[PDB]
Design a protein around this ligand. Structure first.
Ligand SMILES: OC[C@H]1O[C@H](O[C@H]2[C@H](O)[C@@H](O)[C@@H](O[C@H]3[C@H](O)[C@@H](O)[C@@H](O[C@H]4[C@H](O)[C@@H](O)[C@@H](O)O[C@@H]4CO)O[C@@H]3CO)O[C@@H]2CO)[C@H](O)[C@@H](O)[C@@H]1O
Ligand code: CA
Ligand code: CA
Length: 418
């Protein structure tokens, strides 16, 4: 588990991370004020299960609230009112103990940070940016969901809570908080939220200033069709759009190309995610996932958000895929500890580890069989992966002696290793 930036100075922190998304959407409602306490107690098991990092929820307190139709929400962290750590997940003191316990067990803690907007309208907060000083996107004329003079990116919904991240004083505010998270809360890196709401270069700057050598990941969720007609991106692939962001922020990016293929393509089409790209410079910057707090289910109310959920009969296949392939994989809290995929994932993580699969490992796709058949070249062993495939045996696609590593779902999930 080394460190170092990629050959392109991209902050993938050694290319051998295995991340646990340390929360689900309904945590504030299912274990109110008690999440840091649970993470603290489970620190030893997370480390033993094989994760080298954990994506923690937004540490900034959120007392927001909404009701839309028959749904309600708030306090999850994405509509924060100040940097005070005494929120819905637990107290400042409890966060410090969780971070320490996690760090102590060998799991780097990555905080989710939301620079785009804040709960501008909350009455009792410690940050008060008055209007008319250029601190807000809406301090400038705001025609549409396009960059204006006060906000160099898209806006969140109405844009009325969007910050001018480029304003010297705002940039500085975030900068110092990132430094704070790092030296007082054990930050080993950050997950940048809603990266489409502000310039990618600003992310590069923040990291340069506070955590140059840490890990970073940006959440860019914007399809080709969201860009203007005359924009090069309007007719670009999902890979291109996200690679472009990663080149500019110098941070790994969530593989929405893969997610898109998982949702709308067939299993054989998964070789079209950013992680399957034949150029190591492209692959190695992908941060793969099966579902997250937005896309997937969560225990509790409404089944969570489930905006782009994976078909239930592909969950094991999806995990065998991300866990044996290039890019940096992210495991969803619930699959691991709530829905019983624990044993299955532990297995795959051990296979990834023994094989020495890393972010830039080579992967080749075989086309003469049904499903997905891939040969992954780990630094230690070669993996042959067959998902929902009629492949007979590894020898049909690769030379050398093979031993079965995994065999689940009726032969639907098969992995062999040299
Ligand atoms: O003042 C600004 C706006 O305030 C009001 O907006 C509401 C939305 O209507 C609610 O739906 C909600 O927003 C959630 C959102 O549903 C939820 O998915 C989550 O969003 C994140 C996402 O998880 C994350 O991964 C990321 O990439 O981006 C999203 C934004 O960070 O969190 C949102 C915020 O809690 O709450 C807001 C604010 O309460 C109002 O309806 C709008 O008119 C108005 O402009
Ligand atoms: Ca590392
Ligand atoms: Ca914005």
């Amino acid at each position: 588990d080394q460190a170092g930036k990629s050959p392109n100075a991209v902050r993938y922190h050694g290319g051998d991370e295995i991340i646990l998304q340390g929360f689900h959407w309904n945590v504030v409602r299912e274990a109110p004020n008690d999440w840091y306490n649970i993470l603290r107690q489970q620190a030893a098991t997370i480390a033993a299960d094989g994760f080298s990092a954990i994506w923690m929820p937004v540490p900034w307190r959120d007392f927001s609230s909404w009701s839309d139709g028959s749904k309600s929400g708030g306090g999850e962290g994405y509509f924060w009112h100040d940097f005070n750590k005494n929120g819905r997940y637990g107290s400042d003191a409890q966060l410090r103990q969780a971070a320490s316990a996690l760090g102590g067990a060998g799991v780097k803690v990555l905080y989710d940070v939301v620079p785009n907007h804040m709960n501008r309208g909350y009455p009792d907060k410690e940050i008060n940016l008055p209007a008319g000083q250029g601190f807000w996107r809406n301090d400038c004329a705001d025609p549409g969901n396009y960059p204006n003079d006060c906000d160099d990116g898209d806006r969140f919904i109405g844009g009325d809570a969007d910050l001018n991240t480029g304003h010297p004083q705002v940039y500085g505010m975030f900068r110092d908080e990132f430094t704070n998270l790092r030296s007082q809360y054990g930050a080993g890196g950050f997950r940048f939220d809603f990266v489409r709401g502000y310039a990618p270069e600003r992310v590069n700057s923040w990291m340069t200033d506070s955590a140059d050598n840490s890990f970073c990941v940006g959440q860019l969720w914007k399809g080709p069709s969201e860009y203007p007609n005359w924009d090069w991106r309007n007719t670009a692939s999902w890979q291109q759009i996200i690679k472009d962001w990663s080149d500019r922020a110098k941070c790994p990016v969530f593989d929405f190309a893969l997610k898109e293929r998982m949702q709308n393509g067939s299993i054989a089409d998964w070789k079209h995610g950013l992680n399957g790209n034949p150029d190591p410079r492209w692959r190695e910057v992908a941060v793969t996932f099966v579902d997250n707090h937005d896309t997937g289910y969560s225990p509790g109310q409404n089944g969570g958000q489930h905006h782009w959920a994976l078909q239930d009969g592909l969950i094991r296949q999806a995990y065998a895929y991300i866990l044996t392939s290039p890019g940096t994989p992210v495991v969803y809290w619930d699959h691991m500890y709530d829905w019983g995929y624990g044993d299955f994932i532990r297995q795959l993580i051990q296979v990834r580890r023994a094989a020495g699969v890393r972010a830039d490992s080579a992967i080749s796709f075989h086309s003469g069989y049904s499903g997905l058949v891939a040969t992954v070249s780990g630094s230690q062993q070669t993996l042959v992966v067959a998902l929902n495939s009629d492949l007979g045996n590894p020898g049909q696609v690769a030379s050398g002696s093979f031993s079965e590593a995994v065999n689940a779902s009726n032969g639907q999930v098969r992995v062999w290793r040299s």
